[PDB]
Structure formats: structure tokens, C-alpha cells
């Protein structure tokens, strides 16, 4: 359990993209080592052997171990994840972390408390930088549903243009102008 944090705390020592990939791999392997389900504790050895089995099973073992970890330990792992997100722009690690965020948003347990407002800013930004333009649109619409803001409306217009749908951009602009100046 706590071992999973020890690799996670390694996020405070990674700089290069290969270093962050190694961090994700080692965290995946240790998550597999002490998974609640024996079907993953058995696959720990194979994940060490191959590598991509650690990637595929990273979400599954992460969910169970994070569930077992208490509030402080969960917050520590979350801070490690936030260091990874705010440190370097890596499509693979960022997309994997965004997938974790998506599952936790969908799952009844609630989203990861990655930062303030669940990192809906950062997540959206990352979804724009990893070219997941629809993902960034979803995060920007989560911001929108709290209330219309000129920055939010302009960001939606930009994302709609980025999604090659001028119709949505025009409609968003019309809504913005009718609602406010």
C-alpha cells in the first residue's frame, strides 16, 4: 500500500520525459504488486517482464490501491499525480492520467481531487495540448455549466473552430452576445 506512494513521491525527482515514463511504469508495477485483487498480484511479475501490461493494468490496480489508501495517502498520491501533470507535457502519461480522471468522474466514487475545481482548468488545458479537443470541450463545458463567462464563451468558440465545426462556434457567439455585451 504505502510502497505505491514511494514511487509516487518519485515524481518529485523526474524531469525528462523518459524519466516520467519510468516513473509511471514503476508506479504501475508497485500498484500491481499490492493490488487487492489476486489476479493483479499474480500479473505483477508479467508486468515487470514485458512493460505494456503495466500500462494496460495501471488504471485497474490504481483504482483498487487508491481505494484502499486513506485520505492522507490518497492526497499524497494525488499530489504526485499533480506534479506529473504540471511538470512536463507528455502525451502518454498525461493521457493516462486524464483517463484516470475520466473514470473517476464517471464512477460513483467521485473525481480525483487533482487540484482546485478538480483541475478542470488544467485538465482542459492538457486536453487541448494532447489534441483531445473534444475532451477539452467537455472540461470547458463543465466550466460553462457553472455560469457564462466571456473567457469561457471565447474558449468554446476557439475549441469549436479547432473541432472544424463552425456551426457550434457561431451559435456559441450568438448566445454570448444575447446574454451579455
Amino acid at each position: 500500500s504505502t510502497i505505491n506512494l514511494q514511487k509516487a513521491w518519485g515524481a518529485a525527482r523526474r524531469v525528462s520525459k523518459d524519466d516520467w515514463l519510468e516513473w509511471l511504469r514503476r508506479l504501475s508495477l508497485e500498484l500491481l504488486k499490492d493490488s487487492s485483487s489476486p489476479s493483479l498480484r499474480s500479473c505483477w511479475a508479467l508486468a515487470q517482464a514485458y512493460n505494456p501490461m503495466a500500462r494496460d493494468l495501471f488504471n485497474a490496480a490504481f483504482v483498487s490501491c487508491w481505494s484502499e489508501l486513506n485520505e492522507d495517502q490518497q492526497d499524497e498520491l494525488i499530489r504526485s499525480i499533480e506534479l506529473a501533470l504540471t511538470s512536463q507535457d507528455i502525451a502518454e502519461v498525461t493521457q493516462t492520467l486524464l483517463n484516470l480522471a475520466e473514470f473517476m468522474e464517471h464512477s460513483d466514487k467521485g473525481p480525483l481531487p487533482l487540484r482546485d475545481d478538480n483541475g478542470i482548468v488544467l485538465l482542459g488545458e492538457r486536453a487541448a495540448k494532447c489534441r483531445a479537443y473534444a475532451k477539452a470541450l467537455h472540461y470547458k463545458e463543465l466550466e460553462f455549466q457553472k455560469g457564462p463567462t466571456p473567457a469561457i464563451l471565447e474558449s468554446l468558440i476557439s475549441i469549436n473552430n479547432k473541432l472544424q465545426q463552425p456551426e457550434a462556434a457561431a451559435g456559441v457567439l450568438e448566445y454570448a452576445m444575447k446574454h451579455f455585451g
Binding site: 464517471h106 470541450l137 467537455h138 456551426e167 457550434a168 457561431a170 451559435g171 456559441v172 450568438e174
Partner: protein
Amino acid sequence: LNLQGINESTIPKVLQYYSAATEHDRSWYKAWHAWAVMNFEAVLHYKHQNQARDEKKKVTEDLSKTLLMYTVPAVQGFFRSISLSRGNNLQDTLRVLTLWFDYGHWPDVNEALVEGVKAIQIDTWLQVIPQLIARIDTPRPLVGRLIHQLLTDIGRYHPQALIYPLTVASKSTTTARHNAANKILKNMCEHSNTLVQQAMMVSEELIRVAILWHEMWHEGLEEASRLYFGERNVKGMFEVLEPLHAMMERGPQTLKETSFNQAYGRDLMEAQEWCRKYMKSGNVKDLTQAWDLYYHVFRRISKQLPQLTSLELQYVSPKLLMCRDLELAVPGTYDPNQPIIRIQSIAPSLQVITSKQRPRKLTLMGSNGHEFVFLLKGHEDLRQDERVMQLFGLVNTLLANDPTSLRKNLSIQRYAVIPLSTNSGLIGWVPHCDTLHALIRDYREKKKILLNIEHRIMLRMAPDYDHLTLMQKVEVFEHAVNNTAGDDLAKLLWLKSPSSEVWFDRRTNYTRSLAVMSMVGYILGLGDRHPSNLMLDRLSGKILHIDFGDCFEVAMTREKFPEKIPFRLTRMLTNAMEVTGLDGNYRITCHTVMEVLREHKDSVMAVLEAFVYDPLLNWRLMDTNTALNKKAIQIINRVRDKLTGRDFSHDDTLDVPTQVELLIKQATSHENLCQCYIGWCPFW
């Protein structure tokens, strides 16, 4: 015409111009079509004159050469234009078909048809067969003879296309229809041997399977109990039981018929004898005894058939259970030009769907090895729906004619309709088809949300909400709507999606489908479709409609909890739509659909004229309102008014955006929604 219109002083001038264009290029289909259509429009204008003067026979006879002077060349030009085009030619063919049906007593039209129908390809006549078998050998020999000739001609090329429609038609009660069916079917058996007989066997077996003796007696004894116990109509009760008693007397043919006779028929015969003794002796105690017996039989059958789940074909149809490689096209097929799929076999039993109504889920394996699923059902008039699907095909073709609607894939989702005789038939089962009401229930149940919360809020404020005034209802309704968040379907749209991209695409297709269906619903006369009849696709998210009901502008006649607006966009739908709501994509789609309708208003008017004109279907419009033929003419006039922007501002010309905005503002009328039936759950 754009400077003058069509009238007596303008017809020959424009006809001369079109004829000159034809002479300069006789190979140009557009000029021939223009000349024929101008002659048809002249026929319509002189018909307007005929109705203006005759309604205030001599005028009709006087115009019987003026109208022929355009009708005969209209018919001939339509024939030549049809010979010069394919696919869209059916439109021109329809322009012929309705026209001479209205003028099917003049001999010149008969000569023109008899010589000109041979300029049409028979494969395109195949698309006309239903409206031929509706009018074959009716009391108008100049029409009936030609229709019989046409159907016999069709039989020489594609008899399989005629076997099913004529097999259904032969069960019509009319003597002439039955006998004409016999003649054409013999002329077909000259080519196909006994495939007519095989199809008749299959149809009869399916008809018997669709409704058991248990179910026929269930309905009949419910009516008998109502009449004797409710109305005290002894004579009506005996009238209802008379054919039912006759069926029981005739004896069984299958294991469930025999089982019914063993279980219920033995007692039902005693009740029958008591009724017979009353009707010659006056023993009302015998009526009470027979009625109580019928009551017990009815309750026993009602308790017997929630188990009607697995219907074994052995006990209702040994013939069909031992189905073999019958050279019969699979129902729902076929393209004549292609490798027609023959029926290999069917599953040993049927799955019945549990509801107030009990369709049978039939599974069939054809020559290509594929499975085809169908919904057999009785007590159901499917000709209406078949015409509605033809109209959907019309609209889909119109959208396919627009490059905007080709790059933006707009189309109405279609499915099979296969009527059988005696108000029954095979509908067709569509996979991944989910009721919107059931989807909201799914979300609420998975999150432990009570389903009737909105209605409970309404009734807490007003336990007697129904008998309130308009503003009282609006107060209670708006308070309840403010006290709820009708956004379940948006959450399910997000949750059921695997990824953000699929969610985005499904939302786009969803909104486009909503816009297209709302506009088509207003124009074609949508109305009576509760959320139960409103279905969703699991893959595309596009909306489907299974019940068509009275949606021909007559469902608007309702007064007991209407149906005040032909169409509706609910709060739940807008909540699942984009951030823009109406703005952007939805309004653009509505404008595009209305533009397609306006531009091709002539085709839509002709097809709706075809539907409204046919007496067999037109007689069913007397269930609602009004001189039936005059109301039919009025309905076509209102169709033109909607297709010319004259529905909200009759004494004006509504532009496309003007009419769209007026329709939107009608749909925003929450005051109408408070009055409407709660089946359309108004809080969503």
C-alpha cells in the same frame, strides 16, 4: 409565370414556350417535364374553375375537352418524360396515377393510358402495386380494366412481387377484389405453379398464430360481459358471441385450439346453449348463468396468458414448424434485380412481448443464411403506416437531393412494414431501440430516484390539478418545473459514451435528428406520439418513431387532453442538446429542412395528394372530423399553405426563417403544455 402566375391568359403562352424548348432539344428531359407539368397545372387551374362554377355537371362536360386538351397531353408528356428518366420518374408516374384516377371516366384518357403505359419500365410499376390493388375492378370499369391489365402484365415479369400483395388482397371481403385476385393469381400460377398456394398457406398460418382462440375469446368475452353486464345489451352480446360461437362450433385445427376446447370450450358451449335458450324462451336466469360462466372463462384466460412468452409453433402451426426451402421472398425484401433471398426455415418457437398488446417475435433463416426478426401482430391497421414509410422515403430522397443534406447526413430512420389481411401483419424488429421514457427510468432507478417526483410535486401543490383554470395550472406547473432538474438524458448521453469523441459525434447526430424530425413532424402532421413511442439508438443516438397513429393533421382534432401543437421540443431534449440550444446547429438544420420542403413543395403535395385521395385510406379520416372529399381537398390546401408559408400568416408569405421562428415560438407555449395529456410528461 414568375411575373404572371398560372391562369387562362398565361397557360397557352408558356406552353408554346415550353414546346419550342422541346423542339430545340427533344432529348432534354427537363423541357419535356416542364411541358407535361404545365399541362397538369393547366388541368388543375381549369379544375379550380370547374369546382368554382359547378359547386355554385354541365360545366364539367364543357371542360371535358378543355381539360382533355391539357390532360391528354399532360398524360402523354408524363409518359415520355418517365421513359426519359429513372428513379425520380416515379414522381412523374405519380403525377399520372392520381390524375387519371380523378379523370378515369373520359375515353381519351383511357386511350392515352392504354398506348402510353407501355413506355414505362415494369420495374418502376412495381413501386405502384398497392394503389393498383386498392382500385382493381372497382365500380369504374375504365379504371379497373386497365389496372387488371397492368397487374397481369406485372405478373409476367416479377410474379413474386405480386404474390404477397395479392395474397393479402384476396382476403378482402369485396367480391370483385377477391375474384380479380383469383384471376391474376391464376395468370401468375401459369409461371410460378403453387407458390401462390404456399404464400396463402403461410399467410393463413401466420394469421391464426397471431391471435389464439384464447385471445379471440378474451376480447369477445370482455365485450360480451360489457354489453350484458354494463350496457345490458343482451342482443348485442349475442351478436358479439355469434361468430365466436361459430368458430368454437367449427372445431379445432391445432393443439392449442383443442386444448382451449378441452379447458374452456366445453363450458362455453353450455353458456352458448343457455344464451340460445334465452333468445327463444326469455330465461334471464340462464343469461346470468352464461354470463357468470363467461366471466370465469375470461378471468381464467387472463390469468393463463402472462405465460404467453414461449409460443411453440407445433401447437399453433405444424405446417410452419416443418417449413422447408419454399421459393418465397423473405418478408421485408426484395430488390427484383438482385439475388432474392428465399426462406429456408424458422425457429421452433416464438417469443411474445408482454404488454397490453401481445406481438409475436418471429425469427426466420433465409437462403443466404442470415437471420431476420419480425413482430407479428393483430388488431392493427398497417396500410396507414406503410404509406407513412413511403412518405419517409420521399423525404429521405429529397434530402439526398440536397448537397447540404448529403455532406450533413440528414435522413429519417426507416424500417419494415408488412401488412397482412384482417388488420394484422408483420412490422419488423429494430435492434438497439430504447424507449426514452425507459431511459429516464433507467437513470433514476440506478441512482435510486423516485420516478413520479415531478408529478408528486404537482399533486402536492394541487391534488385536483386537472379541473383548474389555465393560469392555475400554469402556476402549479411552473412551480413544479422550477422544483426539478429534467436533465437525465444528457447525463446518460455522457455516461453511456465510451469516450469524449463518440459522445460528441452522438450529440451532433442527436441534435440533427431532433431538428429534422421536428420539422418533418410539423409539415407532415405529427401529433399523437407519447414518449413511449419515441425511441433512441444506442449507437448513433438518432431518434426513431414506432407509432404513427393519426398523424395526418387530424390528430390535432383532439379535445380531451390534446395535442395542441403538432410537434414539441421538451426541456430534457434541450438539456441534452449543445450549449447553443437552438442557436447554431439546430436552427441551421431546421432552416435547411424547410428550404428543401419549400423548393420541392410540388412533390410533397403530390404524394400527400396520393395518400389523401385514395378512398380506402381517406375513409379513415372521418374518425376525427368532416363531405369527406371536400375536407380532403381542404387538407391538401392546408398542406400547400404550410409549404408556401401560409400557416401562421395565411394572408401573407412566410419566409423560411420567419416560419421557423414562429414554429419555435409556438413550441415555447408552456400554457399549451399545461393543458396537454400527462402521457407527454410535461415536466421533462
